[model samples]
Target: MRIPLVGKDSIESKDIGFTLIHEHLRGFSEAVRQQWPHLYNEDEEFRNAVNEVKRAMQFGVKTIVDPTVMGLGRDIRFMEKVVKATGINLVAGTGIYIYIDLPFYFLNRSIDEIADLFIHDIKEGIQGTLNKAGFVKIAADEPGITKDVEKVIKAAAIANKETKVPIITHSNAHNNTGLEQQRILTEEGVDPGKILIGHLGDTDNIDYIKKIADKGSFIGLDRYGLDLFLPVDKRNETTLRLIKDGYSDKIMISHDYCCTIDWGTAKPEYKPKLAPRWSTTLIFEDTIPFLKRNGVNEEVIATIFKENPKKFFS
Candidate 1:
């Protein structure tokens, strides 16, 4: 059964299943070792992967949407390990990531060709159809959503057409990524109900959050405690304000954590820095307690966790 992504039961339902709308496979070492055991250290990586999953479960996360798109280090084998180790529903994805990180070959390809690739991954499984990716992901840099990103979104939409799977988006955490992305999907005739606008809570504008939530799309409040430029307090309060303002049903939460891609440390970084952290303050440790302290009840947490993602699968 496909998972419900966002709605009323999203907040009130129990046995909520605790879905994480965004995450990544943090164990690449296991993948290399499985393919060439003598060439890498599998034991250490395997243990670390298990620990990550255990940590997530401790916070009541039951499933995760790992949208590690192509060229962004989506190790399917590692995701398999996450599922096997944690028994977490580790849903993976297929589609190009942001244009900045795309391979040159994408520039030479047409939307149809990209769609075919995604279709193959869904039908035949990514790299083999044995394990189907539950969702397709694509992203844009700015409000324009970028021309190439537009093509990628169309490709993802076409894949959804064939498999009836949902599409999750990656947009600038700030700006009108939601409205722009929703417009793209609607213009392409893709069902708005099937689109997820990630990083929605990054902004303080409740009206903006309402706009996308009103469009019947999922709103992501997953990027917590990044500690890059925005103060953790402000980010947390902004997120809580949205929930209080009546936008809970359409939202999902995550740490957006990864063990890879760390930018230079202790240096002055720009606003909205897309760097990964190996530390803990901006990770799950802080957010879980914040959710509780803010009076975000278990039922609401479940919608962000279980009901919302489950809706998407459906």
Candidate 2:
């Protein structure tokens, strides 16, 4: 079982121990990033990201899946730098992410045309390099299924049909958008097991989460420390409850931490003070111990941390 990585490399799935299936090396609005030079310094940010992933390595994370794509400012050149500096296996993704509107370039194209682009990214290379995308990503937020959001989801489904790469969504868990996402993907004949419904941990409603997982889809307990959405204790308790109910194989863990996002901070160093546990290291430093103390055993942890992710990308 070989897993794809950035810049023309692949690693065995068995070597991907303690992997975080959803995280970011960088994220920012491309429009703003190109305009406001003061918002970020590339050299400084690059060094910071390398050190951050290297630090997370100390806690046993062997790989990270970065779902940053076109609309979210994905640059394969920059990603290759981080991979070289840290030697951590990083899988890159390709797709579009707009909640309410499709980019103007996609507005007039047929679904087949849009899907062809994504298929090219997976089968050929992303950003014209030898690095093919390992997964397809599409997003829907509190705005629910607008015309363009639905279009992208359908295109992603089509791409999955062609490439067999797994689909990971950016869903608004609060509004039960994962259900709507599943509806569209399934309508396109994509299996639920081929989809990983992301950000399900943001809501404590176990019934809503189980409905998706019950359909054979994986749920991302991926945003472990973003207390601004759901408290850490609630996220842990929800994960524990799901494990007790026999949904362990359908769960994944991650922090969704970006080394630096252009969300308008006072300085480049403001993230830790705002959301202290929002780094990639939080799962190892905090959540795993919390799970153990609350009676989630090692076998279940291995399933969530290792085996399940391998199967997702296998």
Q: In terms of lDDT, which candidate is strongest?
A: 2
Q: On a 0 to 1 TM-score scale, where does candidate 1 land against the true structure?
A: 0.80
Which digits, one per residue and each the tens of the lDDT, describe model 2 over residues 84-130? 88888889988888889877787578988988889888888888898
**What is the C-alpha local distance difference test score of each model?**
0.67, 0.87
| lDDT string, candidate 1, 1-314, tens digits | 44322111112123336666776655233234357657444456567666777877786666666787775656666667656777765677788776443456766778899899888877666665367666788887564566776788788888988888888887766677668878878788778778888776566676787788898888876666555534556667777787787767787766566544322346555457444443322446666578788788877766666677667676
The window of 10 residues in a row where model 1 has the poorest summed lDDT is: 4-13
What overall lDDT, based on C-alpha atoms, would model 2 receive against the true structure? 0.87
The TM-score leader among the candidates is 2
TM per candidate comes to 0.80, 0.94
Give candidate 1 misplaced runs (Cα > 4 Å). Answer: 1-16, 27-46, 100-102, 262-284
True-vs-predicted CA distance for residue 42, candidate 1, Å: 6.7
